[PDB]
Amino acid sequence: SPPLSIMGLMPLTKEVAKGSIGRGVLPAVELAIEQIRNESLLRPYFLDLRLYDTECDNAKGLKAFYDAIKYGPNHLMVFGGVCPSVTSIIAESLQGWNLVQLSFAATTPVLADKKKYPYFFRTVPSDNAVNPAILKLLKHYQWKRVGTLTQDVQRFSEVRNDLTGVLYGEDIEISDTESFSNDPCTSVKKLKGNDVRIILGQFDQNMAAKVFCCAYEENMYGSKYQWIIPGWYEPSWWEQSRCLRKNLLAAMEGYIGVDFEPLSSKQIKTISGKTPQQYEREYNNKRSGVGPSKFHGYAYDGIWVIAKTLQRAMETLHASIQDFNYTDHTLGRIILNAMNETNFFGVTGQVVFRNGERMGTIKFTQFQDSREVKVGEYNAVADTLEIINDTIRFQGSEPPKDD
Amino acid sequence: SERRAVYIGALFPMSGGWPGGQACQPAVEMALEDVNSRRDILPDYELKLIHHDSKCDPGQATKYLYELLYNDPIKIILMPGCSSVSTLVAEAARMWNLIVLSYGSSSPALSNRQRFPTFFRTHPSATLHNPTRVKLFEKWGWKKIATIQQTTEVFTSTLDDLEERVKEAGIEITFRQSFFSDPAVPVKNLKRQDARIIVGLFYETEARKVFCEVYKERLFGKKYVWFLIGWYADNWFKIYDPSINCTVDEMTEAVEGHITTEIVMLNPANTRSISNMTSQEFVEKLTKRLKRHPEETGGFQEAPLAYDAIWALALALNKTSRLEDFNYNNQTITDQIYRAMNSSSFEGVSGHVVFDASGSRMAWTLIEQLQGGSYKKIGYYDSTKDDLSWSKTDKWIGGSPPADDY
Ligand SMILES: *[C@@H]1O[C@H](CO[C@@H]2O[C@@H](C)[C@@H](O)[C@@H](O)[C@@H]2O)[C@@H](O[C@@H]2O[C@H](CO)[C@@H](O[C@H]3O[C@H](CO[C@H]4O[C@H](CO)[C@@H](O)[C@H](O)[C@@H]4O)[C@@H](O)[C@H](O[C@H]4O[C@H](CO)[C@@H](O)[C@H](O)[C@@H]4O)[C@@H]3O)[C@H](O)[C@H]2NC(C)=O)[C@H](O)[C@H]1NC(C)=O
Ligand SMILES: *[C@@H]1O[C@H](CO[C@@H]2O[C@@H](C)[C@@H](O)[C@@H](O)[C@@H]2O)[C@@H](O[C@@H]2O[C@H](CO)[C@@H](O[C@H]3O[C@H](CO)[C@@H](O)[C@H](O)[C@@H]3O)[C@H](O)[C@H]2NC(C)=O)[C@H](O)[C@H]1NC(C)=O
Ligand SMILES: NC[C@](O)(CS(=O)(=O)O)c1ccc(Cl)cc1
Ligand SMILES: *[C@@H]1O[C@H](CO)[C@@H](O)[C@H](O)[C@H]1NC(C)=O
C-alpha cells in the first residue's frame, strides 16, 4: 500500500483560540480517512494525511509549511488553511511547489482572486456567498429599496463591496449607505431620517448589540422594519450600555440572520453511503470530549473531494505517482483539472466548485422571542430560495414595505 | 589565516510594480567589492551574496525565501526590495532569528516593531514627507489643513501619521476626503467647505483626474495651495489622458504654484562619503555596469540606498565581528547585529545614514514649487536636526503666501 501524502495545515494547539476549529474537525477527517482505507477505495494506495500546526500565526504557519516540504514526505496537495492571513500567504505561493490546496474553513473573499490564488479551492462558501442569497430574499418579498449598515473593518467592508455588483442590473436600489467604526447610533439616525425600511447589516456580534440598542431608541423596529444581519453569532450573544435587555429583544425581534448551512437537511445518502443525519451521529460519537465545530461537514466533504480528485488524477495518468516532487508541473495541472470536475452529494449538500469557489447552501434564520430559528435556505447551484412555511413571521398583516 | 565567508540572502525585483532590482543588484555587487577590498572594515570576513529574482511578487518570494533558508550556506541577513516582499520576509524572519534590511520599501506599515522586530530599511517610509509638510505649514503660518487621498493603504497610513504630527504642532485637519478611482465628488466637497491649504495624496493617473476636476471648480489660484508628492513624471499634468476632459493649457493653469515634497536619495553635495566616492562618481560607476541606459533601468534613483545598505550591514558586522557561529535557532548574534544596526551613523552616497526606533531611514527632503509650468527647488528639510535650507526661490501672486481662512 503506497501512501498518497497530503499536507494538513491548521491551528491544532490549545494555546491558540482558532485551535478549536482544527481539533473540532479532526474527528470528521478521521471518519472519512477510515472509510476510504477500510473500503480500499484508492487501492493499491492509502490516503496519508500528515498534520502540521500553523498556530494561526503568519510566521509559525509559514515555517510549518516550509518544515513540511523539507522534512516531510512528498505531499500531493494541501488540506486546510483556517486563519485568513496564514491561508493567503500559503495559497499565494502554491504554484512554486505545484500544490493544489483545499481549505474547509477559510472564508475570506480575497481567496476567490484566481490571478493571485490559482491553485486554491475551498469546500466552504465565502463571506460574500450570503449576497446572492439576500438578493433572492429581497426578490421573494418584493423589497426593491434597501439601506446598508456596515462596520468599518475589512471583514465587513468586503461583503458590502461585493453587494454592489450583486445588486447591479437587478431592480434594487441602495437608497442609503452608512458606515461606522465604534458607535452605530449616528448611522442608525441617518437611516431612520432617510426613511430606510429594509436594512442590510454587516457588523460583528459586539457591534450588533449596539446597533439594536440604537434601533430601539430610533424606533427602527417592528412591523415596518426588516433587519437582515449576520447569522454566525454565538447563541445568547445579546445576554453576554443605555438600553435594557427587554428593549434590545424588542428591537431584535424578527431580524433575519444569514450564514452558510453546516450540513444538508436532505435525508438522502451521500458519497459515503450515509445520509447527513447518520454522518452527524457518527461524528458526535467520534468527537468524544472535543468541542464540535460548524466546519466539521466541510472538512469531511473535503477529504472526499481529495480522494475523488486523486482517483481521477490516477485514471488520467493510466491513460498515457510516486515520482511527484514539487517539480512536476504536469502532475499539479492534472490534480488541478481533476479537482475542477468535482461533483458529488456530500454531507454539506452537492459539492461543486465554480472557479475554486464552493457553490453551496445558505441558511436563513429569524430571531423569534428567545432564539434564532431556521426560516429558509438558498441553493447556490440552482440559484433558488426555499422559504420554510409556518416558520417566518411579521408583526403586521403583511411583510414590511420598502418605503 | 583565511577570511571566513559570511552570506547575505537577497531578493531583487527584476520585474513587477517596482522593478528596482535592475539597478539595485549591480549597486549591491559594487558595494560588496568596495567593502571586501577594504582591509579596515571586515579583515577576517568576506561578505558574499546569494540572490533570487522576487519579481516584486510575495508568492514568488515565498519560494525563494524557502530556497535561502533551507539550503546551505547559512545566511546572516535577508535583503528584500519591494514593500510586499519585505512585509512577508520581515514578518517570517523571527522564526530564523534573522535581521531583515530593505533597500527599496517605502510602506509606512513596515515601521511596526511588533510585526517586524528585526527590520531595517535604508529606504525611508512615505511618512518622511509629513515633518516637511508640518514645517512648511509652520513657516507659512497655517493651522487649518484639508486632506484628499486616493483609497490605498499607503495613503491612509501616511495621513494617519500626518494627523498625529499636526496635533503636536497645534495644527488641525479640517476635512478628509477619499476616492477609489473618481475624484469628482471629493474635489467638489473641498470647494463647498472653502478649504484653502490642501494635502493631496494619489498616484499620477489619479493626480491628472484630480487636477482636471480642480480646473472645473476653480480650486486653484491666489486662494489655494496644493501639497503633492514630488515623485510624478516630468510634466505629468500635460500627459494625454482620454478619460480627462481638460486641456494641457487648462491643467498647466490648475497645477500652477503647487508645492511638492520628495525624499532625497542621492547627496546633492559634491562631498566624498565612507566609500570615498562622490554622488557623481557613484552614478558614473553604476552607469558603466548597466546593460541599458539609466532611463531604461528600474531602481536607478534607489540604487544609492542599496549601495548604502551593504555599508550599513558591513559597518554593523564590523562593530560586532564570531559571525561563522550564526545559526537560525539562536538570538545571541542577531541581538548584537540589531544593536549595532540601530547605532548606525555614517555618510553614504544617499547622504547621512541613520535609522529611527522603527528601523526606518532618516533622510533629507527636497521641496519644490511649480512656477510657470516648471518645478523649481525652493529648499531642503532635515527632520532629525530640524534644519531647513531656504532658497528664497518660492513665488506667490499676493507677493506672499495666502491663508487657511476666509
Ligand atoms: C579619495 O579620493 C581621491 C580620488 O582620486 C581620484 O579619483 C578617483 C575617482 C580616481 O579617478 C583616481 O584615479 C584619482 O586619483 C583621492 O585623492 C588623490 O589621491 C592621491 C593621494 O595622495 C593624490 O595622488 C598624488 O598626490 C601627490 C601630489 O599630487 C599632486 O598633483 C595634483 C595634480 O595632478 C595636484 O592637484 C596636487 O595638489 C598635488 O600637487 C603625489 O606626491 C603622490 O605621488 C606619489 O609620490 C611618491 C613619489 O616618490 C610615490 O612613491 C607614491 O606613488 C606617491 O603616491 C600621489 O600620486 C591625488 O592627487 C589626489 N587627488 C585629488 C583629486 O585630490 C583620495 O586620496 C582618496 N582617499 C582615500 C583613498 O582614502
Ligand atoms: C472546469 O470546470 C468547468 C465546469 O465543468 C462542469 O461542471 C463540473 C462540476 C462537472 O460536472 C463537469 O463535468 C462540467 O463540465 C468547465 O467549464 C465547462 O466546461 C464545458 C466545456 O467542456 C462547457 O460545456 C459546454 O457543453 C456543451 C458544448 O456545446 C454545451 O451544452 C454547453 O453550453 C457548454 O458550452 C461548460 O459550459 C463550462 N461550464 C461553465 C459553468 O462555464 C471548465 O472547462 C473546466 N476546466 C478544466 C477541467 O480544466
Ligand atoms: N522607491 C521604491 C518603492 O518604495 C518600492 S515599493 O515600496 O513600492 O515596493 C516605490 C515607492 C513608491 C512608488 Cl509610486 C513606487 C515604488
Ligand atoms: C571597523 O572596526 C574596527 C574595529 O575597531 C575599527 O578600527 C575600524 O575603524 C572600523 N572601520 C570603519 C570604516 O569604521
PDB file of C-alpha atoms in Angstrom, chain A residues 57-60 62-63 65-67 69-71 89 92-94 96-97 326, chain B residues 57-63 65-66 69-71 88 91-92 94-96 115:
ATOM      1  CA  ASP A  57       0.251  32.787  13.020  1.00  0.00           C
ATOM      2  CA  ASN A  58       1.830  34.097   9.786  1.00  0.00           C
ATOM      3  CA  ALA A  59       5.486  33.236  10.742  1.00  0.00           C
ATOM      4  CA  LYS A  60       4.761  29.906  12.579  1.00  0.00           C
ATOM      5  CA  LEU A  62       4.946  29.622   7.007  1.00  0.00           C
ATOM      6  CA  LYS A  63       7.628  27.713   8.950  1.00  0.00           C
ATOM      7  CA  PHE A  65       4.668  24.723   5.707  1.00  0.00           C
ATOM      8  CA  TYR A  66       8.467  25.040   4.950  1.00  0.00           C
ATOM      9  CA  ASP A  67       9.233  22.265   7.563  1.00  0.00           C
ATOM     10  CA  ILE A  69       8.245  20.463   2.477  1.00  0.00           C
ATOM     11  CA  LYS A  70      11.789  19.990   3.902  1.00  0.00           C
ATOM     12  CA  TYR A  71      11.367  17.131   6.399  1.00  0.00           C
ATOM     13  CA  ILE A  89       0.376  33.513   2.365  1.00  0.00           C
ATOM     14  CA  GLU A  92      -0.361  32.690  -2.963  1.00  0.00           C
ATOM     15  CA  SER A  93       2.799  30.538  -3.130  1.00  0.00           C
ATOM     16  CA  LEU A  94       1.247  27.161  -4.138  1.00  0.00           C
ATOM     17  CA  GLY A  96       6.053  27.264  -6.503  1.00  0.00           C
ATOM     18  CA  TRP A  97       5.554  23.697  -5.300  1.00  0.00           C
ATOM     19  CA  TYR A 326       7.117  19.618  -6.084  1.00  0.00           C
TER      20      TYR A 326
ATOM     21  CA  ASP B  57       5.779  39.235  -6.027  1.00  0.00           C
ATOM     22  CA  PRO B  58       5.226  37.879  -2.449  1.00  0.00           C
ATOM     23  CA  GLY B  59       4.065  34.452  -3.767  1.00  0.00           C
ATOM     24  CA  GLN B  60       7.256  34.132  -5.876  1.00  0.00           C
ATOM     25  CA  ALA B  61       9.370  35.403  -2.949  1.00  0.00           C
ATOM     26  CA  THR B  62       7.895  32.653  -0.645  1.00  0.00           C
ATOM     27  CA  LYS B  63       9.524  30.058  -2.905  1.00  0.00           C
ATOM     28  CA  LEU B  65      12.787  32.621   0.924  1.00  0.00           C
ATOM     29  CA  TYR B  66      12.451  28.848   1.372  1.00  0.00           C
ATOM     30  CA  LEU B  69      16.700  29.318   4.479  1.00  0.00           C
ATOM     31  CA  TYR B  70      16.581  25.573   3.653  1.00  0.00           C
ATOM     32  CA  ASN B  71      19.819  25.408   1.633  1.00  0.00           C
ATOM     33  CA  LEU B  88       6.299  38.860   4.070  1.00  0.00           C
ATOM     34  CA  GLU B  91       7.321  39.017   9.450  1.00  0.00           C
ATOM     35  CA  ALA B  92       8.563  35.440   8.804  1.00  0.00           C
ATOM     36  CA  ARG B  94      11.785  35.997  13.640  1.00  0.00           C
ATOM     37  CA  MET B  95      11.409  32.206  13.230  1.00  0.00           C
ATOM     38  CA  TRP B  96      15.004  32.001  11.921  1.00  0.00           C
ATOM     39  CA  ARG B 115       5.090  42.701  13.470  1.00  0.00           C
TER      40      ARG B 115
END
